[PDB]
Structures are given as structure tokens and as C-alpha cells.
Symmetry: C3
Subunit: 450 residues, 3 copies
């Protein structure tokens, strides 16, 4: 039964439901794809390129198996990198990556082999012959992707998005406004950034107003490219009321290597968030908040590869509710907000929070949590406290095209398995199941973000 | 089959168990019913009155579905309020309310239709014709409710409880001593309250001793009406050792609009809790503690409807163990205490706490948590750490009569499903399962509170 | 329906093949609370009570939770009376792992397939009495196929019986494990007496940090020489930061003179000692086990009466794990094999992601209140979805009683095999790798990690 028809499906009801939704087009509110690569439409050369070269999950697991970096991010050939992953792939059994990579192979290349030393070479060769006919745009069309949203920096000119709107066929590729750098006054680089922003937008950014003026122009810049959302990464959401003169003072201090106090950083951040909210009210943008990623926990990884290189963890010790309280009461009914949490242990907080504010939505299982297990828990749980029906929608969070489909498949099977179970336990009539499941997989998120 | 016989049952064993307990009478340690309504024995007029008019859960989800307040707590006719709920009811699929309301329809009115715009009018008309023969006392008798306990304020006269003991034929309706207002010195009307209390009990309440004297008379007042329990709502249980002079100082400060320090509030609360424990020792009352409800989180709801209007949430950031420690060691073996937790994430704390103090009991899944999902997790989990057998007992927490039976059904099915499973995996012989299940559904709780 | 039979805990066919694959693998037990002297003396037990309840604080708890006075728990009533009370009340244990463990021992070891209750009490006591003679530790160690054990030992210990066990016990390797908690706990009443004992046995001026360290290192070398390969550490709130030796020295000297030390002093002292235990372990390549989250002696009456490990320790969800481990972890990144255990399952995600980012870190088995078919199913499925089930540190018995070993080991392997079975049948894992995964986790993996 490996990756077969009833993969992840445990009841008959689940199977009708999945059959009802499997061919719905993919709507992807958030991913880490680059538009330039779609516009250039260049094939891939290797399964390594496609599957491991830019997947930090793969790097992690690979390191967790005792495979030196030579073959992870280092200077060994793709083919060698590939052979090592396969050598060790059977130890990944149980973890979503094991399933995703195989799903790509079976659904995209139609190579139904199981990965291991024994199979490594035959798979490498079979994929090499097939990779050429494969292009992003061909893949986008094959996987029925209707809309994508990438994550972009306020400073970006959105050039490729422009070109994609022009020439890319049946996909809508929207940018998403992520102003985290702007917000992070603790980051070395903040100043260079604040300096770049004034440059690109024509503003005295060494002043808060000028920087805000620059952020607003950035936001308008994004509006004009069909953008409908802001993504925000926060460890401990701490939003309270922050005076402009204090904000102004801190902002100016920041331009002069002052080690700012925690209060200064916090005040600065609380303030910037309220301003992102104001900006987004004026455009009716969905405000996504990704809470709880402790980043660059692992020093050696930071100093060597830097961010997003495999050393971020979650922590359970976070004041969520009292930290969002001001923001949420402030934009109550005025702003669509979607909440994500990295520690599933915090679902209840966000879930109850969403139960009490019609403008707030619970996101899909986020990072370490997007796994059949996490999806089962996240959904069953969320269904019993708010409404499954308002789930913001599946998010690929993917760095690689092939994932899209397989990621989308996994999600829909699990969601359809979850509802199936409830249908068979007699909690949900089949009719409304069929409707619930369709809404969540497509109509709902489409309506919400677009 | 929706809401059929094996609703919530997943194994044969479960079915024997459920059949064993389905006809046991209902014992309801805690609910938010009014005795006056039971004594007056007035029929309801509408399914709206019966199902939505006073159910804040229904208010929540309706708001979560985008239905304006006009049709929630506003000025639209019951019939319009009803039609809106049904219009949108299919989006509730997955949430316990969807099941509860249908269960009432099927078990009480014998209307086996599924709620939707298509069905709205036919249901409304069928229920209107049947609602007359329906009364509280007839319903109490029908649903086999043997004992209820409402929640009452220390100031109450318990008049209708008196009347109900006199005239209500096969139900025992007991009041429950909830002294939260007395405890909450941060609340606006604390003073007015402290003033009322001395008035009804004849004490100079602007003095701690006089207030205490007043609370004790209240407690004796309750004793005389067959009361056997105190309910306490606490966000962050913080009980330590508080001097009467300090307590006395704070109490007097509180009578003169002093913005008291957090330490003053805390000390005053710590002190009041210990004195509630003392009072309960002398009467051997069960002390219920409901931990973790962040209330009136949503401002607009507070300013508009006020409390219990749909804006309370849970939060995971609570120091439970070290906050209960003083209390618990203090009343170790001297007081029956039941713990409830709003965030399921905190079960392990309370569960291990209960595992170490024979006077401490773990309550049923509490608020956002009473849902087939919540019950399954709460129970399996609790069973593996302490003893399912000492579970305090199912609690309806309901504001509406009809719920009682359906609430009681759901619970017993799930409980019986959970033990069924363990019987089928060979962890529990069927004989002790039958015993376990019967004890938990009736005998245990009845013995524990009565 | 069938209780404690062949498919006990098994919910799918795949699970059954997997379990049959591993049920006969020998037991490797990285951590337990056994005493080597009892193994060396090889003395039979007298009663089921002795064997099952006399020294099992879980049984003490549940009995107290059933309303049975201490007379019959740790008090002065005869074993037989203690036993009869336990049975009287045993049916109320239904659902809790102890109910299943004790029965498993009866059925797998004594072959007494009866179910425990008042009705059965006397017939079980009499059947076990006749069988208990032929039963010995060493006979049991051989019967239950235990290849390796590791006890928990205090740095002051002379490891005498471990010596004798190496010599005369054939078939089993009984290793000591270095637990320096007392040394670390400067808040404890007898810390000083301890610090004094340590210098005595190791010949050092312990009123001094260097001397105490010198003493700890000698203890560590003392353990090395008895084939020890691990240190166990119990911490509530791991708070490891950077602590200067002069401050450490200052605090240590203060501690020798009844000074109520400040929380910072205690914390500093602990942070410092942990980094030093890490250093000592680097030099020997010892596995560093950290058991996080036990609030102990929470219940006073139990403390004043029986003291520690008597049934009054609880878990708490309010712990800063990640930022507390951060210095340690970044400090020994790639240099030290660390295994993490968490007492509140709600903290798994932290340790699990932590382990996902450091190849030298391993997630332990479900620990205390969590080792239960329920805890194991959750712990495992969960861990599988975030790091690799395949690197699980390995099952740990944690047991204070021999008979448990096998039953403990059985429960675990069934559940592990039930969990993997499920994923095999949902089509997430080919059967070949499942067979491999399951065998690795049950034996080869844990063996190579600790040994």
C-alpha cells in the first residue's frame, strides 16, 4: 500500500471526499518561490537540484543521519549528494520528507521505485532523461496551480512578478509584503536596510516619518502588483501602545550604534506592527502572523551558512494572548488576520482567539507541524473549538515547484481523512462533508485572500 | 448513518458499554441553570429561544459565519434569528454545537431532519406544535435528571431553590457557592458588592472581619439549602501565605478607590482563597477550581454586551503548579478539591497534581474542551496517568435544559468508546470496563458530591 | 474480549509482523534504578508484594488514590495484607499502565493467567509463593534476555557490587551511570555533608571548588574504570549560561557557611557545574542524559514523612527549556552526545526541534508519567513527524524491579511496532524499512548509542 490510492485514507467516506477534491486547482497563499525562475522557465538538471539542493529539511535530516556537509551544502557533485541522500533515505521513514520526495517521483516522473542505495543510480538516470521536458510553467500547468503568492521584501522592485503577469499563462503569481527586516531593529544590518529603503523610495529614512513614508510607498508599490497580504514573523508578539515621539526617539537612536534597551526594541516593534496594521486596513490586506520561531538557535550554523540553514527551533515559553491583545482589539472587525503557531501546544490559544474575533483565522499546520500527524491533530482539534470551515487554507510554504502537488495532495487526503472519520462516526452528514471539504480546499481560501 | 445508534462508537465493546449506561439517571454537579424557570415551569415558544437565544456558543459561531448581530442578540424576531442560524448551520459541521442541537431535535422532538435553509421552516413549524407539551419539569423527568447544581452568588436568597425543593417532584436542585465577585477586588463594582453583602447579612463589611463574617453567614445560608460545593474561577492560581493585617489593610484600601498594586490584589486573593478553603473544611464541601479563563479579552464585546458574551479565551502561559502548591499542601487530606483547566495543554499538570493528592480530583473536559475530540483526549490521557475511575464526573455546564440529555449522551458514548477501545486492545477486561463505565457515569460522581 | 493476549496493543496486521520480528531481541537498558548488590546476592523474593508493590512508588500512589490507608502501603501490615488490599482495589486501576504491567509479569513470568481482584487475591498469592523460589534475579536476567543494564549511581559510590557483578554475573553487563545531582544541588540541606564526604573518599579539600572539581573528576575516572558510559542529570528549569570560576568559587565557599544563597548564586553555581560535567564527559565521550521538568517533593506531608521518591513529585508546564539549554547546547555542539527527556509531553516539540537541529542530540523515550501505551503512541508518532523515529535514543525501563524489565520491554516494542504498523498500512512506509526501523530502534540503535 506504499503511496497507493488509499495513502493516508482510513475509511470509505474519506475516499469519496478525496475523490471530490483531488482535481481542484491549487491556490497557494504563501510559498518561498522565486518569480524569476518561473519566468526564465529553465529545466532542472538533477533530482538533487530539484529535491535536496535547496530544501533545508533535507539538509537537516541528512545531518541527523551523520552525513558530513561535504555532501549537503558543500562542494561535492550533485550526483554524489544524491547518492548519499538515497544511501541514508530509509532512515527518514516516518518523516514527511520521506513521503514528499517519493510522491514527487511517483506523481511527476512516474518512477514508482523506493529510494535507497540499491535504487539510487537507476532513479538518477531515469530522472535525468525526464527532467528536460519538465519546466516550471509546464509543471505549474500540470499541477493545476491557479494562484501563488511568494514572499517579498518591501525593498524589492517586483520586476519578475511584472514579467510573470505579462507572459505566464494560467497562473497568478502575487507578491506578499514581508517587512520583518524593517521591524527588526536588533538585527545587524537594520541601518543599511533603512538606508536602502529611503534610497529606493526617496525619503529621509533616518527619520521615522520618512521611513514610514517609505514603507507606505513600498506598500502602494506592492498594491499595484496585485498584492493582498503581509506576512510577519514574531517570536513573542508584544503589541501595546507606542507613542510616535518615543518611536521617533528609538528610531534615531538606532541610527547611531546604540545598544537599545529591550524596552526600546519592544516599543519600536509594537509601534511598527500597529503601523503595518493601519497600512493594511487601507488596502484590506490579509495580515498573516507567524508566531514562535526561535531562529538561529544553533550558532555554528549561523556563522557558517547563516539564516534558514537548519538551526531554528520552536519554544513553548511564549506569552501569546496578552501580547496580541492590543493589536487584536485594535483591529477588531477592521482587518483580516491569520494566525500561525510553531508549537502545536499553542493551538488552543490561537484557536480560542479566533473563536472570539470573526476577523481572525486559524492558519494551516505550519512548519514542523505540516505532516500527516500534525495535520490530523491540528484539524481534528481546530474542528472541535472553532469551525473547520473557516480554516484559512492549505499553505505549501515550499521552496520547490514539484512539492506543490505532493504537498497539496497530502493535505487534501488528510483533511479528507479527518472529515471522513467524522462522517463515519455520525457527526457529519455526507452532504455537508462534501461541501466542507470543497470549501476548505479551494473556494474558502480563494475568497479569503483573493 | 448520521446521529444513529453507533454515533461516536468505533468498536463493538463500546456498544455494550454504552447500552449499559445510557439509561442511568443524570447527575449534574454544575450547570448555569436558573431554578426560577424550573419552578415556573413555563414552556418555550421557539426553537430559537430553546437553542440560540441564550447559548453564547451559538452567538460565537454565528458571528464566525459572518451573520450580523441583528440576528444574534439584536432586534430581529426569533423566527428570523432561527432562519439565519439554519441558513449558516452547515458551516458548523465538525463543531459540537452542530451535534448538540441536532441531538436535541432528534432525541426530544423526534424530528430527524438535518438543519439547513431547506429545512429551516419545516423544523420551526414542527417544533412550534410540540413545544407546548414541553416543560422544564416534564423535560427533567423525561431526561432522567436526578440531581442538578446551579451556580449562585453568595448574596442570593436561594428563594426558588426553596420552592423547587418543595414542589419539584423527582429532581434535586442544589445551589453552588460561587464567591468570585467577593474575591475580585479589581472589578469595578467590588465595593457595591461588599456593601450589598453586609446589608443582606448584617455586618460592617467595610471591614475584613465583617466581610468574612458576612461570607460565612452566606456559606451557612447555602449549607441550609443542601449546598455541597464552591466553584472558583481563577486565571493564574496564586495562593501563598497572607497576614490578616495585610489582608485587612488591602481590604480597607479597596473601599477608597485606591488603584491597588498587583501585590495587594494578589495578597487579597490568596487570602480569600485560603478562607474559602477553611469555610469549606468546616462543611466538607467539594471545592471546584476552574483554572485559566482569560475573560473579556475582546473589548467591543465587553463594552457592548459585557461578560459571557463570546469574548473569553484560554492562554497557555500560566503558572499552575507553583500557584496551587500552598493551597494544596495546606488542605492536603482535609478538603475534596476538583481541578478544571481551560487549556488542554495543562492537563498533565493537574493530572500529576491529582496523582499525588488523594483529596484532589480531575474534572471533565471543561469548556472549549467538551467535544468528542476533547473528551477522547482528556480521557485517554487521564487514564494513563491517574485513574479514569476517579474522574470527578461529567458536567453539563449548560444554560439550557434540552442540552442536558444530549450533553449527557455525547459524554457517555465517548467515555464508553474510549474504554471500549482499551477493552479491544486487551488492556481492560470487559467486567471491569462495565464497572468502570458505570462508576464514572453515575455512582462515582454521585458519591463524590453527594 | 481478550485481555493481555497475542495482539495486545496491536491494531493492524503489519504491526504483528513487526512485533514478531523484535520480540525475541535481547534487552538493552540504558537506565534503570536497580541495585547491583541484589543481583550479586541473587536472593529470591518471598512475595508478590515484595516483587510488585513493596518498592514500586507507582503502586503506592494508586493505592493512596484508591483510599487505602498507608497501614497497607509503606506501613506495618504484613506483605500478605498489603497484597490483598492491592488486589481488593486493583480493578479501579483499569486503564493505567501499572494495571497492565503487574498482570504482564504474572502471565509472562509465573504463567498465572488469572485477573487480579479480591476473588483472585489468595489463589494468586499462593500460586506465586510456590513459584518464587526457583526465581532469581540472575535466572530472571537470563530468562528475560537482558544483555545490558545501567543503574544510577552516586559519584561517592565505590561501585563494589558492580565489580562483583562484572566478575561473577554471566550473560549481563551491569554498568553504573554517573548521577552528580547532589553535588550540583547547593540548595539541598546536606550538600555540605556531601561535599565533605566527597573530599574524604577522593582525598581533596572540598571546601574549595577546585578540590571539589578535582574530587568529581576522580569520581568520574573511578566510574570510567567500571565501564561507565553516561551521566544522568535531573533539572527542573535548565538554566545554563556563562559562569566565571571566581564567582563559582565565591559561591562554593559561601555554601560552606550556612549562607542562604541568592537565586542567582544557586543558578550561577548550577550553570557552572553543568558546563563542567559536560567538559568531563567530553574527555570520555559519555552520553549526557538530561531529564528535564520534575517538580519534586511538591507534597510536603509525603516529604516530611517518607521523604523523596515517595509519591509526591509532579510535572509543570511552566518551564523555559530552549533558552535555558541554548548555551550548553551551542557549547557542546558536535562534541558531546546528549539525550533529552521531558516530563511534560507538552514540551516534546521543544526538545524534538532542538534535536532536529543538533546531530549530537537525541530524543529519549517517553519518560515517567508518560510511559504508557498512550504516552508511547503520542510520543512516537509525534517524534516521527518532526525528527527521525530512527534516531530514538531507545526504550528505557526506569524500573526498580526486575520482573518489570520484560513486561516493560514488551509493552514498548508492541506499541512501537503498532505505530510503525499503522504507517505501513496507511502507505507511508514500505514494509522492508519498517522491519529495519523497528529492529534498529529496539536493539541495534540504542546499543550503538550508549555502547
Amino acid at each position: 500500500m506504499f503511496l497507493g490510492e488509499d495513502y493516508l485514507l482510513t475509511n470509505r467516506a474519506a475516499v469519496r471526499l478525496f475523490n471530490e477534491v483531488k482535481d481542484l486547482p491549487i491556490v497557494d497563499p504563501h510559498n518561498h518561490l522565486d518569480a524569476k525562475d518561473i519566468v526564465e522557465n529553465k529545466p532542472w538538471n538533477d533530482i538533487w537540484e530539484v529535491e535536496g539542493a535547496t530544501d533545508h529539511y533535507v539538509w537537516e535530516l541528512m545531518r541527523r543521519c551523520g552525513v558530513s556537509e561535504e555532501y549537503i551544502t558543500g562542494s561535492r557533485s550533485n550526483k554524489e549528494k544524491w547518492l548519499a541522500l538515497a544511501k541514508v533515505f530509509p532512515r527518514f521513514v516516518g518523516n514527511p520528507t520521506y513521503e514528499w520526495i517519493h510522491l514527487d517521483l511517483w506523481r511527476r516522473f512516474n518512477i514508482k521505485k523506493v529510494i535507497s542505495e540499491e535504487t539510487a543510480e537507476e532513479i538518477w538516470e531515469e530522472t535525468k532523461k525526464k527532467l528536460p521536458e519538465m519546466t516550471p510553467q509546464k509543471l505549474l500547468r500540470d499541477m493545476k496551480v491557479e494562484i501563488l503568492c511568494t514572499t517579498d521584501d518591501p525593498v524589492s522592485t517586483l520586476e519578475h512578478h511584472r514579467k510573470a503577469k505579462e507572459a505566464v499563462e494560467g497562473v497568478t503569481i502575487l507578491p506578499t509584503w514581508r517587512p520583518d527586516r524593517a521591524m527588526n531593529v536588533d538585527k545587524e544590518g537594520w541601518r543599511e536596510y533603512v538606508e536602502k529603503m529611503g534610497e529606493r523610495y526617496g525619503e529621509d529614512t533616518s527619520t521615522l516619518d520618512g521611513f514610514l513614508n517609505a514603507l507606505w510607498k513600498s506598500h502602494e508599490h506592492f498594491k499595484e502588483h496585485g498584492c493582498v497580504a503581509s506576512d510577519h514573523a514574531l517570536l513573542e508578539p508584544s503589541v501595546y501602545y507606542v507613542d510616535e515621539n518615543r518611536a521617533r526617539a528609538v528610531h534615531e537612536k538606532a541610527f547611531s550604534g546604540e545598544k537599545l534597551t529591550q524596552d526600546e526594541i519592544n516599543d519600536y516593534k509594537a509601534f511598527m506592527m500597529v503601523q503595518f496594521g493601519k497600512m493594511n486596513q487601507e488596502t484590506n490586506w490579509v495580515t498573516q502572523l507567524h508566531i514562535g520561531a526561535l531562529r538561529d538557535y544553533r550558532d555554528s550554523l549561523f556563522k557558517t551558512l547563516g539564516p534558514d540553514s537548519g538551526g531554528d527551533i520552536s519554544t513553548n515559553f511564549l506569552r501569546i494572548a496578552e501580547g496580541l491583545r492590543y493589536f487584536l482589539n485594535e483591529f477588531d472587525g477592521k482587518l483580516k488576520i491569520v494566525l500561525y503557531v510553531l508549537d502545536p501546544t499553542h493551538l488552543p490559544t490561537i484557536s480560542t482567539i479566533a473563536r472570539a474575533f470573526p476577523n481572525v483565522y486559524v492558519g494551516a499546520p505550519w512548519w514542523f507541524n505540516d505532516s500527516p500527524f500534525g495535520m490530523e491533530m491540528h484539524l481534528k482539534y481546530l474542528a472541535s473549538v472553532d469551525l473547520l470551515y473557516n480554516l484559512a487554507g492549505m499553505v505549501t510554504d515550499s521552496r520547490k515547484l514539484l512539492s506543490f502537488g505532493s504537498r497539496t495532495e497530502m493535505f487534501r487526503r488528510v483533511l479528507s481523512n479527518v472529515v471522513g472519520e467524522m462522517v463515519e462516526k455520525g457527526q457529519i452528514p455526507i452532504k455537508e462533508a462534501r461541501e466542507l471539504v470543497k470549501h476548505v480546499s479551494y473556494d474558502g481560501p480563494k475568497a479569503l485572500f483573493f
